[PDB]
C-alpha cells in the first residue's frame, strides 16, 4: 500500500540490496543489506 | 566548538530490517548539534524514541523526513536550513509520506525554533496524521526568491488535532503547548530593517549577518551566522590577513586577521590542508597551480612549465556522480602522480553498470594507476581483480593525506578482496584518517606493519578484522621473510619488506 | 569623481609677501573639492577674496586657519575633516590668532555644513572678532574620544555680532541667517543608533559607514562614506576579487570584485600604479616582491629568491621627517637598487644642521648612490658638490617612476647647481611627472635631449629655465660629441650620448 | 607686537628664509623668500 517491488529490468540497481518502489513519489530506491549504505547500497559502512 | 556530525545522503534508501535503519540513524545523529550534510529521518517505525533529534540546531544541506510511522519527531531546537544542497534539486526541507496502513503515522513535528532557510523551498505531501502543520506560515522562513518552487499539500483527512494557543499569532503553531507557537522574524520588522528582527519593534532589529534572529543588535548577538563566524562574531568575509591603507597606498598587516576554513575563521589551518596566499584553507589548488611546502606551510603556488595533469578524484568534476573508476573514466588517469580527491574501486566497475551506461572494466587497465604516488583524499578498494595477489597498481603510492575521509573517518579502506598480500611497498604516510582492513579472506601480512609510524596524527586508529587468521597464515608459512623483520612486510618477498 | 588638490604643510611659515602667500594658496585650492593633505589658511589679509574655498567639500589631513585678518573665510560646503594628520599632534581643526594690531580680523567662518571630524580635536584661541562660532556644539561634530583634549577659548571682545536665527537648534549657528544654523546628526539621533541620523524619529538612522549623514536609511544614502566608496555605495572594504566557498573548501571568483585605490573601489588600477594579487593598487611592491608586466598590466609578483635590495625613500620609515639625505642617514642607502619613495638632496646636508643634530655630509659618501637604478617617486636635487661637474652618483639611475610627485607635479627637479652636464647616462624612462631644470648657471647639454621619448604618460612637461644659454653653450664648444645621434646627449664625452 | 625676531640661537633654522617669532604661540617659524616653500623654507616651487 506504501511500497511495491521493482521490475525485472531493475535487477542491478541495488548493488547490495533489494529494490523498492515508492508509490506516492512514483520512484524507485533500495533496501540495503546490513552493513551497506548509499542510495544504491554502494559502500560498506563501519558496523 | 559545537558538536559535529556528518549526515546522510542515502535519500529514501533503507539499510536492513527497520531496526538496523533506526540503529544507524541513532548512531549517526546522537549528540549531534551541527549537521554538515543532510538530515534524513526515514523509515522510523512507531514505538521508537527519537530523543536525540532534540540536539540538532543547524543543518547545512537538506532535511528529509519520510516514511515514518513514528508518532513524534522532536526537532525542537533546529534553527536553520542552509540549503547548501537540495532534495529533487528544489527542496531544502521535505516531509513526505509519513503514514501507516491504518493511517496511523507521524503526528507531531514540534519545530518551534526553525526561523530561516537561506536557500531552497520545502514540500509537504501525503501527511495524513500530521497535526497542526497546516497552520505554519512559510513566507517567514523561506527567502522570497524561492517562494515560487514552494509546494504545499497541506491537507489533513483526520482533522483531529488541538488548535493553536492564543500566544501563537495568526493561529500558527507547530504543535500544542504555547511553546510550539510559530515565532516570526522576517517580514514583521520595519521598512529600514533588512536583518531578521526579534519583532516589529524597530529597536529590536538584528544584524544582516544574523541568520535566524538575534538576542541583541551587535553581530556577537546573532543566533546563527549567515556566512562566516569569527570566534563568537559573524562576518560576511573572514578578516583579511593584510588590509589596504587608503592613506599610504600600501598593504598593512591586520591583527584580528584570521584564516578562512569552511564557515569558520581559524587562526591556523589544519595540517593536511593547503594554505592559499589569500589567507584561506583549501582542499585543492586550481589548475596551473601546485602544492609545495615552504617554511612549515603547505601552500598553493602558480606553475608555469611542468606542472601536471589536473587528476581530479572520483565524485569531483568530471567524475561528478561516478560510483567507481572504470572504462568510461579510466583513461583520464594515464600519468597522474597526485590525485586531487578520492578513489573508489567498486565491484560494479568489473561487473558493468547498464544504468549508467558503463561497460565492464578490463583488469589490466588498472595498471594505469601505477604512476600515482599521492592521494589527497581517501582510497576505497571494495573490488580487485581476483587473479591478482596484491594491490600491484599502488606499489608506488607513497602518501594518503586524508583531507576527505570516507564517512568522515576512513582514509584507507581495503575490503572484500581475495588478495594474499597488500603490496603497498612505497606507502609511508597516512596524514589523517583511520584504516580499515576487513573481509579479505586470503590476506595475511597486514598485521606485521606498525601502522602508527605511517600516521601523522595522534588518535588515528587501525581496524584490521575478518581477514585470514594470523595463526592460519603462520601455519601456511605466509609470514615476513626472515632477512627483514624489524618493522613488518607488505608481502612474502624481501622487496615487500619495509625496514629490511 | 571629485576634483582633488594636494594640500600644504607649511604650518605657520609665511611664503613671501602676503600677496605671494595668497597667490600660492589660490593656486593650490582653486576648483579643489577634496584636500588629500592639509588645508592651511594663513596670513590672508583684508580685501582678499577667498571665494574659491567654497568648492572644498572634504579635507583628509588637518585644517589650520591662523594669522588671518580677512573678514570671511567661506568654508560653506566643507563637510568632513578626516584628521589623518594632526596639527601639534592633537588638533584636526585649529583656528588661531586671527587678528591685527587694531584687533580687527576674522569675523565670519560660515561652516554651515561641517558635521564630522573623524579623528582629532579642535582648538580655537585668540580670535577676537570671530562671531557666532562660539555657539556651535562641537560634541556632534567631533569624535567621542578626542573630545578629551579640545581647547576652546572663545572671546569676541566686540559682542557686536548678530544673533543666531531662532530656528537654529539650541541657539547654535555658524553665522547670521537660517542658512548658517547648525545641523545635528549625532546628538539628535535615536536610541542605540548605528552611527548617525537624518532625523529625530527612530527610523531615521544612518548606515554605520555613513560619515556626515544620510538622505535615507541605506548605505547608498550616505552623505559621505566613512571608509570606502564602491562607486556610490559606502563599504568597509572593497569587494574581494575572490570569495571563499564554505561548502566547497576552495576559492571562487567574485563578479562584484573590485580593486582598492585610496578610499575608492575601482574596476581597474590607475595607469602608473602597480596591482597586487590582493586586488590593491599600490605605489611600490615590497622587498618580498617585484614589478613586472603581465597581461598588459604591471603587477607585483613574489620574488624568485634573488631579488634586489629595496630601500625606503626620504620621508618614510627611519627617515620620517628628514629633509635630505645626510651623513646620519646615508649609511642606510649602501646596497639599494630601488627606492620606494623619494630622494631629496638639499644644501643643509652638505652644510650641516644644528637643530636636527646632524653633522655635515662627506661628499664622497654620495658615491654609495651609484647602486640606485629605480626611484618610485621623484628626485629633488637642490645641492651638489660644487667641484663635481655632473651627477655622478646617479649615472646608473635608469627609471624615475614618479608615482609620488613634488608639489604634485614634478618628478625630476635639478635646481641651483654648478654642474656643467647632467650625466644621467643610464636614464631611460620618466614614467610620470614633469621635469624642471632651473638655476644651474653652468649647465649645458640639457635642451639637446628629446625628453618626450623619456616620458611614458601623455601630458608630461619639461621646464628648462635660468641655465647657461644654448647659444653660449654652442659658442664656446659645449655641444654633444660627433658620435652622438641627433637624439641628444647627457654630456660632452662619447659615453654621454643617448640611446 | 605679536611677531618678533628670533633669538640668535636660531640663525640657521630657516634654510631659505628669515626667522620670525610668533608670541601668541611662543614658537619660531619662518618667512620664506619668494620661490621657496616649507616650514623651514626647504623646498623650491615654481612661481
Ligand atoms: C557504476 C558507475 O557509477 N560507473 C561509473 C560511471 O558512473 C561514470 O560515469 C564513469 C566515469 O566517471 O565511471 C564509471
Ligand atoms: C632616525 C632619526 O634621527 N629620526 C628623527 C625623528 O625621530 C625626528 O622626529 C625627526 C624630527 O626631529 O628627525 C629625524
Ligand atoms: C637636516 C636634515 O635633513 N636632518 C636629518 C635628521 O633630522 C635625521 O635624523 C637624519 C636621519 O633620518 O637625516 C638627516
Ligand atoms: C581657477 O579656476 C577657474 C576655472 O576653473 C579660472 O577661471 C581661474 O582663473 C582659476 N584661478 C587660478 C588662480 O588658477
Ligand atoms: C590629545 O589626545 C590625543 C588622543 O589620541 C593624543 O594623541 C595627544 O597626544 C593629546 N594631546 C597632547 C598635547 O598630549
Ligand atoms: O622623535 C619624535 C618627535 O620628532 C620631532 C617632531 O616630529 C615630534 O612631533 C615627534 O614627536
Ligand atoms: O534532480 C537531479 C537529478 O540528477 C540526475 C539524476 O540523479 C536524477 O535522478 C536527479 O533527479
Ligand atoms: O610641531 C610639532 C612638534 O614639533 C616638535 C616639538 O616641538 C613638539 O612639541 C611639537 O608638538
JSON list of N, CA and C in Angstrom, two decimals, chain B residues 36 84 192 202-203 207 227-228 237 240 242-251 260-263 273 276-278 280-284, chain C residues 36 84 202-206 217 228 237 240 242-247 249-251 260-263 273 276-278 280-284:
[
{"chain": "B", "resi": 36, "resn": "UNK", "atom": "N", "xyz": [26.60, 18.57, 9.06]},
{"chain": "B", "resi": 36, "resn": "UNK", "atom": "CA", "xyz": [27.41, 19.10, 7.97]},
{"chain": "B", "resi": 36, "resn": "UNK", "atom": "C", "xyz": [26.89, 18.70, 6.59]},
{"chain": "B", "resi": 84, "resn": "UNK", "atom": "N", "xyz": [22.52, 24.13, 1.34]},
{"chain": "B", "resi": 84, "resn": "UNK", "atom": "CA", "xyz": [23.71, 24.01, 0.51]},
{"chain": "B", "resi": 84, "resn": "UNK", "atom": "C", "xyz": [23.61, 22.87, -0.49]},
{"chain": "B", "resi": 192, "resn": "UNK", "atom": "N", "xyz": [13.06, 50.29, 7.21]},
{"chain": "B", "resi": 192, "resn": "UNK", "atom": "CA", "xyz": [14.51, 50.43, 7.23]},
{"chain": "B", "resi": 192, "resn": "UNK", "atom": "C", "xyz": [15.21, 49.10, 7.50]},
{"chain": "B", "resi": 202, "resn": "UNK", "atom": "N", "xyz": [11.28, 48.41, 15.76]},
{"chain": "B", "resi": 202, "resn": "UNK", "atom": "CA", "xyz": [12.49, 48.77, 15.00]},
{"chain": "B", "resi": 202, "resn": "UNK", "atom": "C", "xyz": [13.74, 48.77, 15.86]},
{"chain": "B", "resi": 203, "resn": "UNK", "atom": "N", "xyz": [13.61, 49.01, 17.17]},
{"chain": "B", "resi": 203, "resn": "UNK", "atom": "CA", "xyz": [14.75, 48.90, 18.06]},
{"chain": "B", "resi": 203, "resn": "UNK", "atom": "C", "xyz": [15.24, 47.46, 18.16]},
{"chain": "B", "resi": 207, "resn": "UNK", "atom": "N", "xyz": [21.27, 42.33, 13.07]},
{"chain": "B", "resi": 207, "resn": "UNK", "atom": "CA", "xyz": [22.29, 42.47, 12.04]},
{"chain": "B", "resi": 207, "resn": "UNK", "atom": "C", "xyz": [21.90, 41.70, 10.78]},
{"chain": "B", "resi": 227, "resn": "UNK", "atom": "N", "xyz": [27.05, 33.69, 7.13]},
{"chain": "B", "resi": 227, "resn": "UNK", "atom": "CA", "xyz": [28.10, 33.25, 6.22]},
{"chain": "B", "resi": 227, "resn": "UNK", "atom": "C", "xyz": [29.28, 32.68, 7.00]},
{"chain": "B", "resi": 228, "resn": "UNK", "atom": "N", "xyz": [30.09, 33.55, 7.61]},
{"chain": "B", "resi": 228, "resn": "UNK", "atom": "CA", "xyz": [31.21, 33.10, 8.42]},
{"chain": "B", "resi": 228, "resn": "UNK", "atom": "C", "xyz": [31.00, 33.52, 9.87]},
{"chain": "B", "resi": 237, "resn": "UNK", "atom": "N", "xyz": [32.87, 38.18, 5.31]},
{"chain": "B", "resi": 237, "resn": "UNK", "atom": "CA", "xyz": [34.15, 37.58, 4.95]},
{"chain": "B", "resi": 237, "resn": "UNK", "atom": "C", "xyz": [35.03, 37.52, 6.19]},
{"chain": "B", "resi": 240, "resn": "UNK", "atom": "N", "xyz": [40.65, 39.88, 6.71]},
{"chain": "B", "resi": 240, "resn": "UNK", "atom": "CA", "xyz": [41.83, 39.66, 5.88]},
{"chain": "B", "resi": 240, "resn": "UNK", "atom": "C", "xyz": [43.11, 39.69, 6.71]},
{"chain": "B", "resi": 242, "resn": "UNK", "atom": "N", "xyz": [45.91, 40.89, 5.61]},
{"chain": "B", "resi": 242, "resn": "UNK", "atom": "CA", "xyz": [46.50, 42.19, 5.33]},
{"chain": "B", "resi": 242, "resn": "UNK", "atom": "C", "xyz": [45.45, 43.09, 4.71]},
{"chain": "B", "resi": 243, "resn": "UNK", "atom": "N", "xyz": [45.40, 44.34, 5.18]},
{"chain": "B", "resi": 243, "resn": "UNK", "atom": "CA", "xyz": [44.42, 45.32, 4.75]},
{"chain": "B", "resi": 243, "resn": "UNK", "atom": "C", "xyz": [45.11, 46.45, 3.98]},
{"chain": "B", "resi": 244, "resn": "UNK", "atom": "N", "xyz": [44.35, 47.05, 3.07]},
{"chain": "B", "resi": 244, "resn": "UNK", "atom": "CA", "xyz": [44.82, 48.22, 2.33]},
{"chain": "B", "resi": 244, "resn": "UNK", "atom": "C", "xyz": [44.77, 49.45, 3.22]},
{"chain": "B", "resi": 245, "resn": "UNK", "atom": "N", "xyz": [45.83, 50.26, 3.19]},
{"chain": "B", "resi": 245, "resn": "UNK", "atom": "CA", "xyz": [45.83, 51.54, 3.87]},
{"chain": "B", "resi": 245, "resn": "UNK", "atom": "C", "xyz": [45.51, 52.62, 2.85]},
{"chain": "B", "resi": 246, "resn": "UNK", "atom": "N", "xyz": [44.33, 53.23, 2.89]},
{"chain": "B", "resi": 246, "resn": "UNK", "atom": "CA", "xyz": [43.99, 54.25, 1.89]},
{"chain": "B", "resi": 246, "resn": "UNK", "atom": "C", "xyz": [44.94, 55.44, 1.90]},
{"chain": "B", "resi": 247, "resn": "UNK", "atom": "N", "xyz": [45.54, 55.75, 3.05]},
{"chain": "B", "resi": 247, "resn": "UNK", "atom": "CA", "xyz": [46.41, 56.91, 3.14]},
{"chain": "B", "resi": 247, "resn": "UNK", "atom": "C", "xyz": [47.78, 56.63, 2.53]},
{"chain": "B", "resi": 248, "resn": "UNK", "atom": "N", "xyz": [48.41, 55.52, 2.92]},
{"chain": "B", "resi": 248, "resn": "UNK", "atom": "CA", "xyz": [49.75, 55.20, 2.45]},
{"chain": "B", "resi": 248, "resn": "UNK", "atom": "C", "xyz": [49.77, 54.51, 1.10]},
{"chain": "B", "resi": 249, "resn": "UNK", "atom": "N", "xyz": [48.62, 54.05, 0.60]},
{"chain": "B", "resi": 249, "resn": "UNK", "atom": "CA", "xyz": [48.53, 53.32, -0.66]},
{"chain": "B", "resi": 249, "resn": "UNK", "atom": "C", "xyz": [49.40, 52.06, -0.64]},
{"chain": "B", "resi": 250, "resn": "UNK", "atom": "N", "xyz": [49.42, 51.38, 0.51]},
{"chain": "B", "resi": 250, "resn": "UNK", "atom": "CA", "xyz": [50.23, 50.18, 0.69]},
{"chain": "B", "resi": 250, "resn": "UNK", "atom": "C", "xyz": [49.48, 49.20, 1.59]},
{"chain": "B", "resi": 251, "resn": "UNK", "atom": "N", "xyz": [50.01, 47.99, 1.68]},
{"chain": "B", "resi": 251, "resn": "UNK", "atom": "CA", "xyz": [49.39, 46.93, 2.46]},
{"chain": "B", "resi": 251, "resn": "UNK", "atom": "C", "xyz": [49.96, 46.90, 3.88]},
{"chain": "B", "resi": 260, "resn": "UNK", "atom": "N", "xyz": [40.63, 31.41, 6.65]},
{"chain": "B", "resi": 260, "resn": "UNK", "atom": "CA", "xyz": [39.28, 31.00, 6.29]},
{"chain": "B", "resi": 260, "resn": "UNK", "atom": "C", "xyz": [39.24, 29.49, 6.08]},
{"chain": "B", "resi": 261, "resn": "UNK", "atom": "N", "xyz": [38.47, 28.79, 6.91]},
{"chain": "B", "resi": 261, "resn": "UNK", "atom": "CA", "xyz": [38.33, 27.34, 6.80]},
{"chain": "B", "resi": 261, "resn": "UNK", "atom": "C", "xyz": [36.86, 26.99, 6.98]},
{"chain": "B", "resi": 262, "resn": "UNK", "atom": "N", "xyz": [36.23, 26.50, 5.92]},
{"chain": "B", "resi": 262, "resn": "UNK", "atom": "CA", "xyz": [34.81, 26.18, 5.99]},
{"chain": "B", "resi": 262, "resn": "UNK", "atom": "C", "xyz": [33.99, 27.43, 6.20]},
{"chain": "B", "resi": 263, "resn": "UNK", "atom": "N", "xyz": [33.09, 27.38, 7.17]},
{"chain": "B", "resi": 263, "resn": "UNK", "atom": "CA", "xyz": [32.33, 28.54, 7.60]},
{"chain": "B", "resi": 263, "resn": "UNK", "atom": "C", "xyz": [32.96, 29.22, 8.81]},
{"chain": "B", "resi": 273, "resn": "UNK", "atom": "N", "xyz": [45.63, 20.15, 5.23]},
{"chain": "B", "resi": 273, "resn": "UNK", "atom": "CA", "xyz": [45.09, 21.08, 4.24]},
{"chain": "B", "resi": 273, "resn": "UNK", "atom": "C", "xyz": [46.20, 21.96, 3.66]},
{"chain": "B", "resi": 276, "resn": "UNK", "atom": "N", "xyz": [46.23, 28.88, 0.89]},
{"chain": "B", "resi": 276, "resn": "UNK", "atom": "CA", "xyz": [46.39, 29.80, -0.23]},
{"chain": "B", "resi": 276, "resn": "UNK", "atom": "C", "xyz": [46.92, 31.14, 0.26]},
{"chain": "B", "resi": 277, "resn": "UNK", "atom": "N", "xyz": [47.54, 31.88, -0.65]},
{"chain": "B", "resi": 277, "resn": "UNK", "atom": "CA", "xyz": [48.11, 33.18, -0.29]},
{"chain": "B", "resi": 277, "resn": "UNK", "atom": "C", "xyz": [47.05, 34.18, 0.13]},
{"chain": "B", "resi": 278, "resn": "UNK", "atom": "N", "xyz": [45.80, 34.01, -0.33]},
{"chain": "B", "resi": 278, "resn": "UNK", "atom": "CA", "xyz": [44.73, 34.91, 0.09]},
{"chain": "B", "resi": 278, "resn": "UNK", "atom": "C", "xyz": [44.44, 34.81, 1.58]},
{"chain": "B", "resi": 280, "resn": "UNK", "atom": "N", "xyz": [43.22, 31.57, 3.08]},
{"chain": "B", "resi": 280, "resn": "UNK", "atom": "CA", "xyz": [42.18, 30.59, 3.32]},
{"chain": "B", "resi": 280, "resn": "UNK", "atom": "C", "xyz": [42.75, 29.18, 3.21]},
{"chain": "B", "resi": 281, "resn": "UNK", "atom": "N", "xyz": [42.08, 28.24, 3.87]},
{"chain": "B", "resi": 281, "resn": "UNK", "atom": "CA", "xyz": [42.48, 26.84, 3.85]},
{"chain": "B", "resi": 281, "resn": "UNK", "atom": "C", "xyz": [41.72, 26.14, 2.73]},
{"chain": "B", "resi": 282, "resn": "UNK", "atom": "N", "xyz": [42.45, 25.54, 1.79]},
{"chain": "B", "resi": 282, "resn": "UNK", "atom": "CA", "xyz": [41.83, 24.93, 0.62]},
{"chain": "B", "resi": 282, "resn": "UNK", "atom": "C", "xyz": [42.11, 23.43, 0.61]},
{"chain": "B", "resi": 283, "resn": "UNK", "atom": "N", "xyz": [41.19, 22.69, 0.00]},
{"chain": "B", "resi": 283, "resn": "UNK", "atom": "CA", "xyz": [41.35, 21.25, -0.18]},
{"chain": "B", "resi": 283, "resn": "UNK", "atom": "C", "xyz": [42.13, 20.90, -1.44]},
{"chain": "B", "resi": 284, "resn": "UNK", "atom": "N", "xyz": [42.18, 21.80, -2.42]},
{"chain": "B", "resi": 284, "resn": "UNK", "atom": "CA", "xyz": [42.89, 21.54, -3.66]},
{"chain": "B", "resi": 284, "resn": "UNK", "atom": "C", "xyz": [43.20, 22.87, -4.34]},
{"chain": "C", "resi": 36, "resn": "UNK", "atom": "N", "xyz": [43.64, 66.26, -0.30]},
{"chain": "C", "resi": 36, "resn": "UNK", "atom": "CA", "xyz": [44.26, 64.99, 0.06]},
{"chain": "C", "resi": 36, "resn": "UNK", "atom": "C", "xyz": [45.25, 65.15, 1.21]},
{"chain": "C", "resi": 84, "resn": "UNK", "atom": "N", "xyz": [43.60, 62.58, 9.31]},
{"chain": "C", "resi": 84, "resn": "UNK", "atom": "CA", "xyz": [44.69, 61.62, 9.15]},
{"chain": "C", "resi": 84, "resn": "UNK", "atom": "C", "xyz": [46.01, 62.19, 9.67]},
{"chain": "C", "resi": 202, "resn": "UNK", "atom": "N", "xyz": [12.96, 57.35, 15.28]},
{"chain": "C", "resi": 202, "resn": "UNK", "atom": "CA", "xyz": [13.82, 56.16, 15.36]},
{"chain": "C", "resi": 202, "resn": "UNK", "atom": "C", "xyz": [14.15, 55.53, 14.02]},
{"chain": "C", "resi": 203, "resn": "UNK", "atom": "N", "xyz": [13.32, 55.75, 13.00]},
{"chain": "C", "resi": 203, "resn": "UNK", "atom": "CA", "xyz": [13.54, 55.15, 11.68]},
{"chain": "C", "resi": 203, "resn": "UNK", "atom": "C", "xyz": [14.44, 56.00, 10.79]},
{"chain": "C", "resi": 204, "resn": "UNK", "atom": "N", "xyz": [15.04, 57.06, 11.33]},
{"chain": "C", "resi": 204, "resn": "UNK", "atom": "CA", "xyz": [15.84, 57.99, 10.54]},
{"chain": "C", "resi": 204, "resn": "UNK", "atom": "C", "xyz": [17.34, 57.78, 10.73]},
{"chain": "C", "resi": 205, "resn": "UNK", "atom": "N", "xyz": [17.76, 56.64, 11.26]},
{"chain": "C", "resi": 205, "resn": "UNK", "atom": "CA", "xyz": [19.18, 56.38, 11.47]},
{"chain": "C", "resi": 205, "resn": "UNK", "atom": "C", "xyz": [19.89, 56.16, 10.13]},
{"chain": "C", "resi": 206, "resn": "UNK", "atom": "N", "xyz": [21.22, 56.30, 10.17]},
{"chain": "C", "resi": 206, "resn": "UNK", "atom": "CA", "xyz": [22.07, 56.08, 9.02]},
{"chain": "C", "resi": 206, "resn": "UNK", "atom": "C", "xyz": [22.78, 54.73, 9.14]},
{"chain": "C", "resi": 217, "resn": "UNK", "atom": "N", "xyz": [17.93, 55.65, 4.66]},
{"chain": "C", "resi": 217, "resn": "UNK", "atom": "CA", "xyz": [18.40, 54.70, 5.66]},
{"chain": "C", "resi": 217, "resn": "UNK", "atom": "C", "xyz": [19.39, 53.67, 5.13]},
{"chain": "C", "resi": 228, "resn": "UNK", "atom": "N", "xyz": [35.25, 53.27, 2.70]},
{"chain": "C", "resi": 228, "resn": "UNK", "atom": "CA", "xyz": [35.44, 53.10, 1.27]},
{"chain": "C", "resi": 228, "resn": "UNK", "atom": "C", "xyz": [34.18, 53.48, 0.51]},
{"chain": "C", "resi": 237, "resn": "UNK", "atom": "N", "xyz": [35.24, 47.43, 3.24]},
{"chain": "C", "resi": 237, "resn": "UNK", "atom": "CA", "xyz": [36.37, 47.05, 2.40]},
{"chain": "C", "resi": 237, "resn": "UNK", "atom": "C", "xyz": [35.86, 46.83, 0.98]},
{"chain": "C", "resi": 240, "resn": "UNK", "atom": "N", "xyz": [36.23, 41.81, -2.28]},
{"chain": "C", "resi": 240, "resn": "UNK", "atom": "CA", "xyz": [37.41, 41.00, -2.60]},
{"chain": "C", "resi": 240, "resn": "UNK", "atom": "C", "xyz": [37.30, 40.42, -4.00]},
{"chain": "C", "resi": 242, "resn": "UNK", "atom": "N", "xyz": [38.31, 37.63, -4.99]},
{"chain": "C", "resi": 242, "resn": "UNK", "atom": "CA", "xyz": [37.89, 36.24, -4.86]},
{"chain": "C", "resi": 242, "resn": "UNK", "atom": "C", "xyz": [37.22, 36.03, -3.51]},
{"chain": "C", "resi": 243, "resn": "UNK", "atom": "N", "xyz": [36.31, 35.06, -3.48]},
{"chain": "C", "resi": 243, "resn": "UNK", "atom": "CA", "xyz": [35.49, 34.75, -2.32]},
{"chain": "C", "resi": 243, "resn": "UNK", "atom": "C", "xyz": [35.73, 33.31, -1.90]},
{"chain": "C", "resi": 244, "resn": "UNK", "atom": "N", "xyz": [35.87, 33.07, -0.60]},
{"chain": "C", "resi": 244, "resn": "UNK", "atom": "CA", "xyz": [35.96, 31.70, -0.13]},
{"chain": "C", "resi": 244, "resn": "UNK", "atom": "C", "xyz": [34.60, 31.02, -0.19]},
{"chain": "C", "resi": 245, "resn": "UNK", "atom": "N", "xyz": [34.60, 29.74, -0.55]},
{"chain": "C", "resi": 245, "resn": "UNK", "atom": "CA", "xyz": [33.38, 28.95, -0.56]},
{"chain": "C", "resi": 245, "resn": "UNK", "atom": "C", "xyz": [33.36, 28.07, 0.68]},
{"chain": "C", "resi": 246, "resn": "UNK", "atom": "N", "xyz": [32.45, 28.29, 1.63]},
{"chain": "C", "resi": 246, "resn": "UNK", "atom": "CA", "xyz": [32.41, 27.42, 2.81]},
{"chain": "C", "resi": 246, "resn": "UNK", "atom": "C", "xyz": [31.97, 26.00, 2.50]},
{"chain": "C", "resi": 247, "resn": "UNK", "atom": "N", "xyz": [31.10, 25.81, 1.51]},
{"chain": "C", "resi": 247, "resn": "UNK", "atom": "CA", "xyz": [30.65, 24.46, 1.16]},
{"chain": "C", "resi": 247, "resn": "UNK", "atom": "C", "xyz": [31.75, 23.68, 0.46]},
{"chain": "C", "resi": 249, "resn": "UNK", "atom": "N", "xyz": [35.47, 23.66, -0.04]},
{"chain": "C", "resi": 249, "resn": "UNK", "atom": "CA", "xyz": [36.66, 24.24, 0.60]},
{"chain": "C", "resi": 249, "resn": "UNK", "atom": "C", "xyz": [37.67, 24.75, -0.43]},
{"chain": "C", "resi": 250, "resn": "UNK", "atom": "N", "xyz": [37.25, 25.68, -1.28]},
{"chain": "C", "resi": 250, "resn": "UNK", "atom": "CA", "xyz": [38.08, 26.22, -2.35]},
{"chain": "C", "resi": 250, "resn": "UNK", "atom": "C", "xyz": [37.66, 27.66, -2.60]},
{"chain": "C", "resi": 251, "resn": "UNK", "atom": "N", "xyz": [38.54, 28.41, -3.24]},
{"chain": "C", "resi": 251, "resn": "UNK", "atom": "CA", "xyz": [38.27, 29.81, -3.56]},
{"chain": "C", "resi": 251, "resn": "UNK", "atom": "C", "xyz": [37.56, 29.93, -4.90]},
{"chain": "C", "resi": 260, "resn": "UNK", "atom": "N", "xyz": [41.27, 48.25, -4.91]},
{"chain": "C", "resi": 260, "resn": "UNK", "atom": "CA", "xyz": [41.32, 49.33, -3.92]},
{"chain": "C", "resi": 260, "resn": "UNK", "atom": "C", "xyz": [42.28, 50.42, -4.39]},
{"chain": "C", "resi": 261, "resn": "UNK", "atom": "N", "xyz": [41.82, 51.67, -4.36]},
{"chain": "C", "resi": 261, "resn": "UNK", "atom": "CA", "xyz": [42.63, 52.83, -4.73]},
{"chain": "C", "resi": 261, "resn": "UNK", "atom": "C", "xyz": [42.28, 53.95, -3.76]},
{"chain": "C", "resi": 262, "resn": "UNK", "atom": "N", "xyz": [43.13, 54.16, -2.76]},
{"chain": "C", "resi": 262, "resn": "UNK", "atom": "CA", "xyz": [42.81, 55.12, -1.72]},
{"chain": "C", "resi": 262, "resn": "UNK", "atom": "C", "xyz": [41.57, 54.69, -0.98]},
{"chain": "C", "resi": 263, "resn": "UNK", "atom": "N", "xyz": [40.59, 55.59, -0.89]},
{"chain": "C", "resi": 263, "resn": "UNK", "atom": "CA", "xyz": [39.30, 55.29, -0.30]},
{"chain": "C", "resi": 263, "resn": "UNK", "atom": "C", "xyz": [38.25, 54.91, -1.34]},
{"chain": "C", "resi": 273, "resn": "UNK", "atom": "N", "xyz": [50.22, 53.09, -11.34]},
{"chain": "C", "resi": 273, "resn": "UNK", "atom": "CA", "xyz": [50.28, 52.30, -10.11]},
{"chain": "C", "resi": 273, "resn": "UNK", "atom": "C", "xyz": [50.28, 50.81, -10.43]},
{"chain": "C", "resi": 276, "resn": "UNK", "atom": "N", "xyz": [48.56, 44.50, -6.87]},
{"chain": "C", "resi": 276, "resn": "UNK", "atom": "CA", "xyz": [48.92, 43.28, -6.17]},
{"chain": "C", "resi": 276, "resn": "UNK", "atom": "C", "xyz": [47.90, 42.19, -6.48]},
{"chain": "C", "resi": 277, "resn": "UNK", "atom": "N", "xyz": [48.29, 40.94, -6.21]},
{"chain": "C", "resi": 277, "resn": "UNK", "atom": "CA", "xyz": [47.33, 39.84, -6.29]},
{"chain": "C", "resi": 277, "resn": "UNK", "atom": "C", "xyz": [46.25, 39.96, -5.23]},
{"chain": "C", "resi": 278, "resn": "UNK", "atom": "N", "xyz": [46.45, 40.80, -4.22]},
{"chain": "C", "resi": 278, "resn": "UNK", "atom": "CA", "xyz": [45.43, 41.08, -3.23]},
{"chain": "C", "resi": 278, "resn": "UNK", "atom": "C", "xyz": [44.24, 41.84, -3.81]},
{"chain": "C", "resi": 280, "resn": "UNK", "atom": "N", "xyz": [44.77, 45.23, -4.93]},
{"chain": "C", "resi": 280, "resn": "UNK", "atom": "CA", "xyz": [45.07, 46.53, -4.33]},
{"chain": "C", "resi": 280, "resn": "UNK", "atom": "C", "xyz": [46.08, 47.26, -5.19]},
{"chain": "C", "resi": 281, "resn": "UNK", "atom": "N", "xyz": [45.82, 48.55, -5.43]},
{"chain": "C", "resi": 281, "resn": "UNK", "atom": "CA", "xyz": [46.69, 49.38, -6.26]},
{"chain": "C", "resi": 281, "resn": "UNK", "atom": "C", "xyz": [47.67, 50.10, -5.34]},
{"chain": "C", "resi": 282, "resn": "UNK", "atom": "N", "xyz": [48.93, 49.67, -5.37]},
{"chain": "C", "resi": 282, "resn": "UNK", "atom": "CA", "xyz": [49.96, 50.26, -4.54]},
{"chain": "C", "resi": 282, "resn": "UNK", "atom": "C", "xyz": [50.93, 51.05, -5.42]},
{"chain": "C", "resi": 283, "resn": "UNK", "atom": "N", "xyz": [51.72, 51.90, -4.77]},
{"chain": "C", "resi": 283, "resn": "UNK", "atom": "CA", "xyz": [52.76, 52.66, -5.45]},
{"chain": "C", "resi": 283, "resn": "UNK", "atom": "C", "xyz": [54.09, 51.93, -5.54]},
{"chain": "C", "resi": 284, "resn": "UNK", "atom": "N", "xyz": [54.28, 50.87, -4.75]},
{"chain": "C", "resi": 284, "resn": "UNK", "atom": "CA", "xyz": [55.54, 50.14, -4.78]},
{"chain": "C", "resi": 284, "resn": "UNK", "atom": "C", "xyz": [55.34, 48.76, -4.19]}
]
